[model samples]
Target chain A: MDRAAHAVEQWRSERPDLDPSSMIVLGRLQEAALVIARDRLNPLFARYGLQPGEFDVLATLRRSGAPYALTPTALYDAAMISSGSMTNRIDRLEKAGWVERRATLVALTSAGRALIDDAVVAHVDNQRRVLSALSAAEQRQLAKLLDKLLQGQ
Target chain B: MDRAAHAVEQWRSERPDLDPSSMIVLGRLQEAALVIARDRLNPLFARYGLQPGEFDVLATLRRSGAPYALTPTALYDAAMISSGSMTNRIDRLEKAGWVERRATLVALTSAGRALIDDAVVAHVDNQRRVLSALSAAEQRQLAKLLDKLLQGQ
Candidate 1:
């Protein structure tokens, strides 16, 4: 839903006096991002047998430089999930034969590796599609801008 | 606690062959943004005695620049909330005396307007603070970049 539009209207009604330009811009941005994410992400998730959170966890692990292993604590924080939730993700993924746990390090199985490899290609492709409207320069500029806005994340 | 770091390490193990650069970048960005939003936004919601979603609705109404009203169907689509969820938000907001349904429109009340005014000022100040790390040029660039990455809802 276009909550941004709704939110701005609410503010105008409540306080007819405030400057809502900034708020409107920000809300539109948020709405736009959400729409793209939902539209482009769901199918990829379904194809790879991943939920958004699971995809996130797998993606994070898949991108790790080596060992493909990380602590549950760190996983939780990076995945933006609760500790209990991470456990759930790990449990579900592990049972699915897409991931495995070893000692204190949770790692992907061969199948999991294959899954992520395939998914990355598609993910990047989807990202490209999602951002297709922008020029290369605009893409870079946007990334740079968002990087700063999203700095420290 | 540090889910991001853990996820990164896991990715290293899952696909040592692939460049996890994008994943690393996205993870850090999401983590940082979430943390920042929580701190900056939670209080604004609290100040209005509203939940985050309700605050969004109120703010949307305030920014419309006219009529200060929208249909429930319109709101659901704009806010990216489910129809059921919108109903919940509207119920609570209406009960709290911040909003009401008049004829065919669901709208904010004078009290809602007053609440949002205080919230908008504080929110803008906080947004500036969090985004202050970037210059005005940087802010524009970031906004532009985000515009490139997303355009939705």
Candidate 2:
């Protein structure tokens, strides 16, 4: 049995009255999420001198098209970070020459664009490598399941 | 399209050279993982006066079979936390009267077992509710795919 299934078996034996079946899916999902982000993905971004939050901001701007800009509120909302923390991130990213503040908006610089363009491609590939255990068809099924779950959120 | 698929489309339009197929699976998994943990699961644990790390320790102990105990090293390893952070977590759980330390080993008290038993049942129910969007077969398939990915870790 896998670790998650083993955990379910343990719960069943210890507390027979409680059904731990859901953990067979949830446990592995949680573990894989943390491992993939912290162990696999974070290091890849780190090589580009970007933390996860910083990468999120740059990637958001990069994919925003054309002028590649957003207000601090929009940036924070998209990255799921607070506005106060966003100020600090913007300050640091600006110093790194990856982003700049113009009026009330944050925009990616040419340096930032070039850096993230390379990083984003590598990041996607790294994410792909992490899921290489699943066949292409299995990946599609997994994505569909995740989409259903996310739509409920 | 879901937020993740929308994100891949945005990336594709902006950076046509990069393949974003991996994100169709990995990105949604990451977002769903975060949402379920932050929104659904953590609140259930909070009702029992448990943080995520505290719940992890108690669950690890409860699932370790008879005696419901483990050494500090073993507990930290199983929970995938640093030794320093585990010490802080043990101190907090001990203060909450949910656990006790005996030399190098940590064990759940009767109170701890009682709390975790109730909490685990509720936790599983919460997880099931989070995945209510998927069928039972989908849940099983997602679990298998997750198991395959985790095996590579």
Candidate 3:
């Protein structure tokens, strides 16, 4: 049995007064993300010398196209944060030379561009590999189902 | 678009060379868990006077049957390394009068059992409410799909 199922089974055996069925879905949702990120995504990111959140910022810049940059405010809108935290990340990326500050933007350096370019290809490959457990159709259905789930939330 | 879709959209627009389709699946898997855990589960946990991972220990103890206890070693087996941190939880619960440290076991006290008994019912309700985004059929399919997804990993 999967982790969540076993958890509910214990509840069933011990505390039958309350149905513990909902945990199957909620628990799996959390567990899947935890496992996939910790085991798969994270190691891949580490190979590129990036934390997942750092890769997220780099990816965000890389995907914004030409000049590969965004102002800190824009970065914050894609904000995801407190200025203190945002500035801290920018400081790290800058120190590592993957990113640099401009008068108006925090842009990827040529080195940053090259780093992320290589990293993203491997990153995407790792992502695809993890999803191989599902078929193309199943993958699509899972994403769609989740999209629907998030919409209601 | 939800966060993941928006992410892929940028990739589609900026770096068309590498298909970012896989991100939809992987990203949503992570984001769904993050959102529900942060936005929902953590809030409910706070209401119950707990923090992340705190409830996991209590629930583990409660599900182990009457006297509701597990040796630290047994707890470690169940958690892998929750003992690494669960002793910390046991300490807090003990302080709060919810649990006790015995010679061989960390068990729920009467107060702890009462607290968990109440929290667990509400926990299941919160789970059901969050899961309202999906139909019964969808929930089942998602669970099966995810359980299967984790296998080849």
Candidate 4:
């Protein structure tokens, strides 16, 4: 909260008409995501020559059962990227032999499955270290609170 | 964790070597950030011609003491975008009469300050309603837990 928490104090001194406390929560939420990516996940994903979105694409396909296929719609939402980018990713991945476009579905190639299967295990392990700041109980609390936080949205 | 929580089961079913439980926290972490932006902040910011990154750039300048000046690097990090995107955004904001580029520093124009000044109040209020799912104590706990969550990172 170094950046966000201080911004609140600065706002208090500079723009007292608006309360900056809300920013601490919202700001930290986004920052935490970025931190986990930049410090933890991206480094491991890089070893596989993967971007976070690409890793998401491959991991998503890996988890959805046999033949390892999903629609572009499913891929975009799972990767949290726009549809246009998904099309481009699919094109590149297809060319790389990571995926094959068959009818309306994108199926993972055997090559992609092999790549992601190894990467996903390392990816999850990297995630474990990212949560080292919190205890197991705290991690569960965070999971629960985050669930409640976005329940309405 | 609808997608991510179920992903745990799928991974258990598909690749039992990994534990998907960590994802419940990290997955919801990113999802919560996106939900707040899409459902809450973006609607309000749209009324003011502000994107999340733009709003962050302007609000960041607004809260930092006076003259409202920041380096391009500062703006890039605050906006949570790549430097290339920051350059494009700064150029656009400059052309839009919102910001003026000075020597290695981006200063808020009077117009920019006025725009963010109006937009930031609405943004905080939108964020407040977004947290209506939690009690004030819960909100504070979420904030504190998030603080702790990123402390080691």
lDDT of 2 by residue, A29-145 (tens): 888887787889889999999976788889888888868899977775555222146778888999999998888999999999999888988898788788788889988988888
TM-score of chain A of each: 0.80, 0.88, 0.89, 0.89
Please give the distance, in angstroms, between residue A2's alpha carbon in candidate 4 and its true position after superposition.
0.8
RMSD (CA, Å), each prediction: 4.6, 2.5, 2.6, 2.7
lDDT of 3 by residue, A12-123 (tens): 9987898787788777777777778778888999988896578877887888888888997777556221123667788888999999888889999999999989999999
Model 4, span A1-153: residue lDDT tens: 377777787788988788777888888888887777777888898899886578778888888889899998876655532214677777777888989988899999999999999998888888888888898999999988888987867
DockQ-based class of model 4: medium
- lDDT for residue B100 in candidate 2, whole number 0-100: 96
TM-score head-to-head 1 vs 3, winner: 3
Residue-level lDDT for B75 in candidate 2: 80
> Tens-digit lDDT track for model 3 on B1-153?
766787788888878899889998877777777778888888998999987877888888888888788997776556411224666777887888878888788988887888889999999989888888899999999988888777767
Evaluate residue A10 in candidate 3 and report its C-alpha lDDT on the 0 to 100 scale.
90
* Candidates 2 and 4, the one with greater DockQ: 2
Docking class of 2: medium
lDDT of 1 by residue, A54-88 (tens): 87667666666456677776565455333236778
Write candidate 1's Cα lDDT for B13-130 as tens digits: 6556654434433343344445554666566677768786787677666665456788876666555233247788888899889989988788889998788767768877666666
The alpha-carbon deviation from the true structure for residue B65 of candidate 2, after best TM-score superposition, in angstroms, is: 3.2
Q: Give the worst 10-residue stretch by lDDT in candidate 4 chain A.
A: A76-85
- Write down the C-alpha DockQ for each prediction: 0.34, 0.57, 0.55, 0.54
TM-score of each: 0.76, 0.92, 0.91, 0.89
After superposition, the stretches of candidate 4 with alpha carbons farther than 4 Å from their true spots are: A73-84, B71-84, B102-104
